[PDB]
Design a protein around this nucleic acid. Structure first.
Ligand SMILES: Nc1ccn([C@H]2CC[C@@H](COP(=O)(O)OP(=O)(O)O)O2)c(=O)n1
Ligand SMILES: [Ca+2]
Ligand SMILES: [Mg+2]
Length: 341
DNA sequence: GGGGGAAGGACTA
DNA sequence: TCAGTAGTCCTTCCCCC
């Protein structure tokens, strides 16, 4: 099995550079402005010029401006990025029937029935990069290996504007030398749990009792890591089907007043239904982020589709439930629809 | 023990 | 006043065979 992973380079920022070439060469930072106050919000992404200075996705916009006050700060235009992405995804579809769109700027292609070996896989990779560059003027990084996990790892090692093949011998080397924290699906929390078990490399998961590992990180992740370490991981590339659609916004001020929160909630529902387009959900969840940034949610699944009117009435009840069961003030409020018919 | 379902978590983008 | 937004899958917990 041969998997080819495509990962668009610093995507949002790159799209803004393509739409406005005068920005090339300068540090560009795409931001999510919350509106609570001047420059409140976080960085969605930044081009590599800005990253050289430590500006990365996730950091407060103010922190970024303290480090790079003269960079170009742009508001995120998600709709634009989505349209460019869909066009690029359509180009990828021409190279394989078996394609998994993981997110807005990542996709896995099973090309095992398209190429004879990694030599040809590498060439298809170059062809894919050239096609996207030709059509959309966007650079991407390609990762190639025996399965989805190592194809992605390859892309991580090669970005930006790269192409990397991780052959069978290198997979074995990585199983023994790659820090387990760099394996997809292993975040800080899980990495620390593993640390306590003396596990820092995939190979280490083969020196401990499965029972002990499963007790620390759960059966799902335990079987996952072991299959990888044993080099048996071969999960198929599956066509992605949207399971949920939602919208969450930050309020001007923290609140516990139902009438003050409702407008934000209804606005989120309107935007959610716009995005649903044709899809009809059977489940609705109201999600709230409290003043201390904890996340609380209350939902309901109906035996039928949810009309926009039902969404309005039910969302109010779910919100009242949240206010009745949690005493903290709310900072962000939103909704998420799922279980489509 | 575990199927189901709701809600809390962890993780990726 | 540092603390966004979108989406997926697994765990925890409780009711109840
Ligand atoms: N914490 C995050 C992280 C990523 N993102 C989004 C933004 C863009 C999209 C692609 O990100 P990039 O191509 O810049 O990531 P890269 O490949 O590591 O350079 O993922 C977001 O909104 N918040
Ligand atoms: Ca990317
Ligand atoms: Mg990690």
């Amino acid at each position: 099995m041969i998997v080819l992973f495509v990962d668009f380079d610093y995507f949002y920022a790159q799209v803004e550079e393509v739409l406005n070439p005068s920005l090339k060469g300068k540090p560009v930072v795409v931001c999510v402005f919350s509106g609570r106050f001047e420059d409140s919000g976080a960085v969605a992404t930044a081009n590599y010029e800005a990253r050289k200075f430590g500006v990365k996705a996730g950091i407060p916009i103010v922190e970024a401006k303290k480090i790079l006050p003269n960079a170009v700060y742009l508001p995120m235009r998600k709709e634009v990025y989505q349209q460019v992405s869909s066009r690029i995804m359509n180009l990828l579809r021409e190279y394989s029937e078996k394609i998994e769109i993981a997110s807005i700027d990542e996709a896995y292609l099973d090309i095992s029935d398209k190429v004879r070996d990694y030599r040809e896989a590498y060439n298809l990779g170059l062809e894919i990069k050239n096609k996207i560059l030709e059509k959309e003027k966007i650079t991407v990084t390609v990762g190639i290996s025996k399965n989805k996990v190592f194809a992605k790892i390859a892309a991580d090692m090669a970005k930006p504007n790269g192409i990397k093949v991780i052959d069978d011998e290198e997979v074995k080397r990585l199983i023994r030398e790659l820090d387990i924290a760099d394996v997809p699906g292993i975040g800080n929390i899980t990495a620390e749990k593993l640390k306590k078990l003396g596990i820092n490399k995939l190979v280490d998961t083969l020196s401990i009792e499965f029972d002990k590992l499963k007790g620390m990180i759960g059966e799902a992740k335990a079987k996952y890591l072991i299959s990888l370490a044993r080099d048996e991981y071969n999960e198929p590339i599956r066509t992605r089907v949207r399971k949920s659609i939602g919208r969450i916004v930050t309020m001007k001020r923290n609140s516990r007043n139902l009438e003050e929160i409702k407008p934000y909630l209804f606005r989120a529902i309107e935007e959610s239904y716009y995005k649903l387009d044709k899809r009809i959900p059977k489940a609705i969840h109201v999600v709230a982020v409290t003043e201390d940034l904890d996340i609380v949610s209350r939902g309901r699944t109906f035996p039928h589709g949810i009309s926009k009117e039902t969404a309005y009435s039910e969302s109010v009840k779910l919100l009242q439930k949240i206010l009745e069961e949690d005493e903290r003030k709310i900072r962000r409020i939103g909704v998420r629809f799922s279980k489509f018919i």
